[PDB]
Design a protein around this ligand. Structure first.
Ligand code: 9DG
Lengths: 324, 381
RNA sequence: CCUUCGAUAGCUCAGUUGGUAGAGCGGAGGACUGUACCUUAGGUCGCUGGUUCGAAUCCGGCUCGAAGGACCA
């Protein structure tokens, strides 16, 4: 399997470059929400030497995804020649060629193609949706074969269809035949058993030479169910939600606690015993409780370090679990 | 005759600027030195390793701020402030008083102490000098401060404040039995006038407290009368005792106060450059790919640029706020190192001319107070 | 080919009982001189045409759509 380092506008949330160097287990590929990279495309259009040197992380590979999974979107707002991106920029009329200019400026290693048909959030309308989602991939493959560094960049395909069985089946079948690097599963936001066996059939319909991705699914038990149903890569927007509400994850990978209860203000133990993050290494849980009481900006950083360390350690554990 | 905590091997010729070493129970601090406030450092999210990486040696604390929460008894149980915010070096605790929190949030002042309150309505207490020194014994710091009567403010109220500070220093000395584990400083009051201030200086030079501190100045301070008070105070005191100063953070204020003999000085999003303050919210150099200062050894310049933090400043706000604030503290530390290194090279008139012309363009554009004080101490620009 | 609905700050939307515009997420200016943030700009409300003193609000049509039967599978 695998995970993507969830970055909001270049760097990790509440983490600087030195503090990212403090985190253990950061992947070599970093997710970039394309919505936060609207004006960044202009800056990189007249920066002209890549985004890795721009943000200060050129040694890592990059991935661009259109949807920030913290703000995924409604039951349907996407169009079938454009994808609106939830975040800070890219609503009206984002063409495939606009995406071509964006990926030329960013120069990502991988990039997610566009999509339509969010109704899973009947037959013939899903046929139209799937045909348009193939029109996107055809346009991307036509406009990708031109430039050499863009020829070094890799298309990732999108599977659509909705809750319908046969239409998403034929979406997988007729989207597989294109010469594409990888695949995405879309419209699977929470979870029901209907989408579960739809996933089970559709990932069985796709060839086994390509990676599978998904959006809007990061809670660990749905991660385990999608791993056993056929998804390779996941986003990491769940520990951001854990830290945003002021909680800290506690489940042993190898659930969570709200520190605003008064019972932990005497303990000298860290949040997780034996945790190798910075917060558990030096600080105590009483101080985290204390600074959450006064609502300052430091416990967000310490907790955010702890949640990333725990959550990427969970991904390390599930990579090693299927390895054995 | 207490042993002196300060030693000096540095004497400028054209000026009276000084540079020396202070021994404290967690290390040695080079005078002059700047001190980031611990409340705003904890508020702006710089961790322990990021603040220690710049080379800082003194941080700051308050009696009130830990007394309200998490409680003096919990802090005393854990030997709090050095194992709590995890500051491995020495720290100076401000005793507090009539700060920006005042009678809109304070309470009645009686002889025994000053009553402190909280948004917690049941948390109202009476901060007595014995109470304050008990709390500051519970904090376990390295330089404790006697309880102050801060004024901005002129009149007989300042005379009452300085007399009451003399009496409260007597109460503080007679209260605690730690003259050797921790060092107690004495706040010299006097407001904006020099006669009651002068007899106050005489009064606690009769007292044998190891440290002296000028207080009650910043907030409504005019810089000419400021440097005049600093000069007369530093002339009055013996040269083997340190002179803490309050509320000095700007660069020219700091360096000219070093020229007069000081040794201590002490919302994010604005960087500090050798040409001054550079607010990084500016869209005027949002396309600049150079570092903030090409000579600054802070990690922000050497790894990042200006365009990247311009993008990051409000999007993921916490990380860019961290970057900006650690750059500011690194700049202040490098400025102190430059001033001390120039003074040890006996180049300080030339150095003050040099950076004066650097961050002011020419001697004609400089403020009158810096030129006036440097000419008075004996340095021409 | 037909039926219903959407297009609003850079982004999500409210506002649709018609009053040209707000909230949040994002930007910009300042203050940070011993700490229980302030101020401010930006959006021809997709296009075309119409009613009306007046549209974002209502609509014929176009583009980009979404749902559904699909002129075609
Ligand atoms: N120690 C100390 N701090 C402050 C902060 C404002 N005024 C003062 C003062 O006079 N003394």
């Amino acid at each position: 399997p695998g995970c993507l380092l969830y970055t909001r506008t270049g760097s990790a949330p509440h983490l600087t470059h030195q503090t990212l160097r403090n985190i253990h287990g950061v992947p070599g590929i970093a997710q970039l929400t394309l919505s936060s990279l609207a004006e960044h495309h202009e800056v990189l259009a007249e920066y002209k030497k890549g985004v890795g040197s721009f943000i200060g992380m050129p040694e890592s590979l990059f991935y661009c995804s259109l949807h920030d999974p913290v703000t995924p979107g409604p039951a349907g707002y996407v169009t079938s020649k454009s994808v609106s991106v939830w975040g800070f920029g890219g609503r009206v009329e984002m063409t495939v060629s606009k995406f071509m200019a964006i990926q030329e400026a960013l120069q990502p290693d991988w990039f997610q193609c566009l999509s339509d048909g969010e109704a899973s959030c009947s037959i013939k309308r899903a046929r139209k949706s799937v045909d348009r989602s193939l029109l996107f991939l055809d346009s991307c493959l036509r406009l990708q074969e031109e430039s050499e560094v863009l020829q070094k960049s890799v298309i990732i395909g999108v599977i659509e269809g909705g809750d319908v069985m046969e239409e998403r089946l034929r979406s997988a079948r007729e989207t597989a035949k294109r010469p594409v690097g990888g695949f995405l599963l879309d419209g699977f936001q929470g979870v029901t058993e209907t989408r579960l066996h739809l996933l089970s059939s559709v990932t069985a319909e796709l060839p086994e030479d390509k990676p599978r991705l998904i959006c809007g699914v990061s809670r660990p038990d749905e991660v385990l169910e999608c791993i056993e149903r056929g998804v390779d890569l996941f986003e990491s927007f769940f520990p951001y939600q854990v830290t945003e509400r002021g909680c800290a994850l506690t489940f042993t990978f190898d659930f969570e606690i709200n520190l605003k209860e008064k019972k932990y203000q005497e303990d000298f133990d860290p949040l997780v015993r034996g945790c190798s993050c910075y917060c558990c290494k030096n600080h105590t849980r009483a101080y985290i409780h204390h600074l959450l009481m006064t609502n300052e900006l430091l416990a967000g950083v310490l907790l955010m370090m702890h949640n990333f360390e725990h959550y990427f350690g969970f991904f390390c554990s599930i990579r090693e679990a299927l390895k054995n | 005759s207490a042993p002196r905590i300060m030693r000096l091997v540095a004497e400028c010729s054209r000026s009276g600027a000084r540079a020396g070493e202070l021994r404290l129970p967690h290390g040695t601090v080079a005078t002059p030195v700047f001190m980031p406030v611990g409340t705003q450092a904890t508020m702006k999210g710089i961790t322990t390793e990021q603040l220690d990486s710049l080379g800082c040696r003194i941080c700051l604390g308050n009696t009130y701020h830990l007394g309200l929460r998490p409680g003096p008894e919990l802090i005393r149980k854990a030997q709090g402030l050095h194992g709590f915010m995890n500051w491995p070096h020495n720290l100076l605790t401000d005793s507090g008083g009539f700060q920006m929190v005042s009678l809109f949030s304070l309470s009645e002042v009686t002889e025994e102490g000053v009553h402190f309150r909280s948004p917690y309505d049941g948390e109202e207490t009476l901060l007595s000098p014995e109470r304050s020194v008990e709390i500051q014994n519970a904090l376990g710091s390295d330089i404790i401060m006697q309880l102050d009567h801060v004024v901005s403010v002129t009149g007989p109220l300042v005379e009452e404040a300085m007399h009451r500070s003399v009496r409260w220093l007597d109460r503080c000395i007679a209260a605690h039995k730690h003259p050797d584990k921790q060092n107690l400083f004495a706040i010299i009051q006097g407001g904006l006038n020099a006669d009651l201030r002068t007899t106050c200086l005489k009064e606690m030079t009769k007292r044998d407290v190891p440290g002296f501190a000028i207080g009650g100045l910043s907030g409504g301070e005019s810089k000419a009368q400021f440097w005049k008070m600093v000069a007369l105070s530093t002339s009055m005191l013996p040269k083997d005792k340190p002179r803490y100063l309050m509320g000095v953070g700007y660069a020219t204020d700091l360096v000219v106060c070093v020229a007069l003999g000081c040794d201590m000085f002490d919302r994010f999003g604005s960087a500090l450059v050798p040409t001054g303050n550079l607010q990084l919210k500016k869209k005027q150099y949002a396309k600049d790919f150079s570092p903030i200062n090409p000579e600054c050894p802070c990690p922000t310049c050497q790894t990042h640029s200006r365009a990247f933090l311009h993008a990051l400043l409000h999007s993921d706000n916490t990380t860019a706020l961290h970057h900006l604030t650690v750059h500011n503290i690194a700049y202040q530390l490098q400025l102190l190192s430059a001033v001390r290194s120039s003074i040890l090279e006996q180049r300080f008139p030339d150095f003050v001319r040099n950076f004066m012309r650097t961050m002011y363009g020419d001697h004609s554009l400089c403020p009158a107070w810096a030129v006036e004080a440097l000419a008075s101490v004996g340095i021409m620009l």
